[PDB]
Structure formats: C-alpha cells, structure tokens
Amino acid sequence: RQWALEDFEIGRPLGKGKFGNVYLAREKQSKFILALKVLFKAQLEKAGVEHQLRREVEIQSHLRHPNILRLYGYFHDATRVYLILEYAPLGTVYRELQKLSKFDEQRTATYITELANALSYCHSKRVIHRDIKPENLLLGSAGELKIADFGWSVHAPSSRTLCGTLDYLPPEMIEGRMHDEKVDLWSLGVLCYEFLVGKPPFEANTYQETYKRISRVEFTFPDFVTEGARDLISRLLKHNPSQRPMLREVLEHPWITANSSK
Ligand SMILES: Nc1ncnc2c1ncn2[C@@H]1O[C@H](COP(=O)(O)OP(=O)(O)NP(=O)(O)O)[C@@H](O)[C@H]1O
C-alpha cells in the first residue's frame, strides 16, 4: 500500500534523529500504534546519504527477528522521508543506563545474549550493523532488547562516509581500513564493558585522544568487574579482527551462561 502522512495521527516525539525526529504515531484505519522516523530530504541530500537511507530501508525491511526492530514500510513527500517503524515502548538501553548508572551481571549478560542472537541472524545474511551503541538498542513491551537504526548497515565486506563519536568503532573503521562482520563483535565487547562499568572502555574528552586509545586498545577494568566478565570482554576487544570470537562462542561463554536469563 502507498502510504501518506494523512494516514497517521502523530503523537509525542520519541527521539531526535540526525535528520529530524521520531514520533509515536497511530495509523487511522487500524488504530495501529507505531513510530515515524522523519528525515528532511534537504539534509539527506546535503550529506549525500540517500544510499544509506536506501540501505537502511532495504536491509531492515527484510529482517525478521524478535530482537531486531521491525521496519514496516516507508513513504515521503515534497519535503521529507518517513520511515514506518515498530514502536519500542520501553525506550533505549541508553536511558536505562543513565537511570541505573550501570547494570548487574544478570541484566548485562541477558542483553548480550539477545544482541548476539540478533547479530548472528544479521551475520547469517552477511549484514553488518556497524552502529551498535546504547541509543540504538530499544526495549520491547516485555523489556526485551531490539537492535534498531540500520542507517549504517552494509553487506560485508566493506570500506568507508564521515563520523561522530568513536566510542564504539573498531580500529579497522577509525583507520578507514576494510572491514567485515567482525566490527559488530568489537562493539558488543564495548557494550558489555559499558553496561557493567557505566561508561565505554575508551572514553575520553578528546576525539584525538579516543582515537589513540581505540587504536592502541587501551582499557583497564574497575575492581568490581568479575574475572568472568573480564575474560569475555578481553576476547571481544582484540585489535586483530580475526582474533575476535564468533557469536556462537559468545552465546556459549561460561560467564554468559551463568548469568543470562534468555
Ligand atoms: N521505534 C522507536 N521507538 C521508540 N523510540 C525510537 C524508535 N526509533 C527511534 N527512537 C528514538 O529516536 C532516537 C533516534 O532514532 P534513530 O533511529 O537512532 O535516528 P538516527 O537519525 O539514525 N540517529 P542515530 O541512532 O545516532 O544514528 C533513538 O535515540 C531513540 O531514543
């Protein structure tokens, strides 16, 4: 069906995107509640990311997994583009991380499991998300994690568009080098550390400074991180992409098994 803005009643803003906001919305005919990612064509062109936005719609609309946010369709007009997304009721893992400061091992390992499963599915299709970070992880009604925002996804292998914060990016990406699905493994390790510590392992006040840290893989554990968490995070944060484990090995790691709920 060919959609149009008149088909929806827009509600409160759910977030600030990079080219517009996301709104809670209801489809007039079915009363279906969902989200509307609104991007201004102006900016989309000024950044020449129409290829990304196309890769986002094309990749995400074809994914079908309970731990991956659903993209139902899209439409647009003289001015903007509208992505029709599955609405995540419980917000971002990011906000939850602000609220709780840091997660316990049970919550952390559970989120990692849902992620690994979701990434496994994405890697079976040779799809690399490449932008795994707290603000792209949404929570379902039952509090289940759902990877969202495929605005950077691309099929492996690949090269590289400009950047923002490097916090979750692998050395191979910040060094412009070629990369594959291993990129997401590095990010998963960054997340696991951030979940337990309250902040990313390579954080810094300077972009230049953060680049050095990621490049050198310079991170240390606070005393309260258990050895089981340190082992997993250390296997995940290897400079050489090839050393990074398979998602299966993550899903099976002892620390994950002993702590995870799913
Ligand atoms: N389906 C949704 N349900 C609830 N909130 C959402 C949904 N989609 C997006 N948001 C919120 O809107 C924000 C940005 O959405 P997002 O898809 O990440 O847009 P973006 O333009 O790709 N920016 P970025 O994630 O930094 O690349 C997220 O931080 C969420 O908090």
Curated annotation (Swiss-Prot):
Activity regulation information from UniProt: Activation of CDK1, appears to be an upstream event of AURKA activation. Phosphatase inhibitor-2 (PPP1R2) and TPX2 act also as activators. Inactivated by the G2 checkpoint. Inhibited by GADD45A and p53/TP53, and through dephosphorylation by protein phosphatase type 1 (PP1). MLN8054 is also a potent and selective inhibitor. Activated during the early phase of cilia disassembly in the presence of CIMAP3. Inhibited by the small molecule inhibitor VX-680.
Variant or mutagenesis effect after changing F219A: Decreases the interaction with phosphatase type 1 isoforms
Region (Activation segment): 155-166
Effect annotated for changing C163A: Enhances stability
Binding site for ATP: K18, K37, E86, Y87, A88, E135, N136, D149
Outcome reported for the amino acid change (mutating T161D): Mimics phosphorylation state and increases kinase activity
A single GO molecular function term of this UniProt record: ubiquitin protein ligase binding
GO annotation, biological process: anterior/posterior axis specification; apoptotic process; cell division; centrosome localization; cilium disassembly; G2/M transition of mitotic cell cycle; liver regeneration; mitotic cell cycle
DNA-binding recorded as keyword: no
Source domain of life: Eukaryota
Active-site positions on this chain: D131
Name of protein: Aurora kinase A
Taxonomy of the source species: Eukaryota, Metazoa, Chordata, Craniata, Vertebrata
Residues represented out of the complete protein: 126 to 389 of 403
